[PDB]
Amino acid sequence: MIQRTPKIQVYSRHPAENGKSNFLNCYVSGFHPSDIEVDLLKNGERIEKVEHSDLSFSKDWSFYLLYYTEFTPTEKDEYACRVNHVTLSQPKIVKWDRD
């Protein structure tokens, strides 16, 4: 057996073809086993509608998830990604840096 803790990165992107749109991304990488729970949070509340959840693997024991959806951030709201995985004794919450 092998188990590897996910790396978690939270960032925003504007698609170049529609630059007014903005997407909140949580990229969860290099994890094993593949069992996982991932949410985007707005002010601590789970965002129920997440448009995209793309899972892949490289080696048979290395998984990658890109979990992202359109959002409209204001200066006051706080966004984050929350991950649960067998390697994490507590849920890991990674806050989005606004810049």
Swiss-Prot record:
Subcellular location: Secreted; Cell surface
Recorded name of the encoding gene: B2M
A cellular-component GO term for this protein: extracellular region
Keyword Signal tagged: yes
Organism, scientific name: Homo sapiens (Human)
Keywords: Amyloid, Amyloidosis, Disease variant, Disulfide bond, Glycation, Glycoprotein, Immunity, Immunoglobulin domain, MHC I, Pyrrolidone carboxylic acid, Secreted, Signal
Domain of life (superkingdom): Eukaryota
Statement: the UniProt record of this protein carries the keyword Aminoacyl-tRNA synthetase: no
Glycosylation (residues): 2, 20, 42, 49, 59, 92, 95
Assigned protein family: Belongs to the beta-2-microglobulin family.
Role of this protein: Component of the class I major histocompatibility complex (MHC). Involved in the presentation of peptide antigens to the immune system. Exogenously applied M.tuberculosis EsxA or EsxA-EsxB (or EsxA expressed in host) binds B2M and decreases its export to the cell surface (total protein levels do not change), probably leading to defects in class I antigen presentation.
Disease field: Immunodeficiency 43: A disorder characterized by marked reduction in serum concentrations of immunoglobulins and albumin, and hypoproteinemia due to hypercatabolism. Patients may suffer from recurrent respiratory tract infections and severe skin disease.
Modified residues (Pyrrolidone carboxylic acid): 3
GO MF term (any one): structural molecule activity
Description of how the protein assembles with itself and partners: Heterodimer of an alpha chain and a beta chain. Beta-2-microglobulin is the beta-chain of major histocompatibility complex class I molecules. Polymers of beta 2-microglobulin can be found in tissues from patients on long-term hemodialysis. B2M alone (not in complex with HLA-I) interacts with M.tuberculosis EsxA (ESAT-6) and an EsxA-EsxB (CFP-10) complex; the tripartite complex can be detected in the host endoplasmic reticulum. The B2M-EsxA complex can be detected in patients with pleural tuberculosis and is stable from pH 4.0 to 8.0 and in the presence of 2M NaCl.
Protein name per its UniProtKB record: Beta-2-microglobulin
Post-translational modifications reported in the UniProt record: Glycation of Ile-2 is observed in long-term hemodialysis patients.
Effect of residue 61 to V: Increases tendency towards amyloid formation
Domain Ig-like C1-type, residue spans: 6-94
Cysteines paired by S-S bonds: 26-81
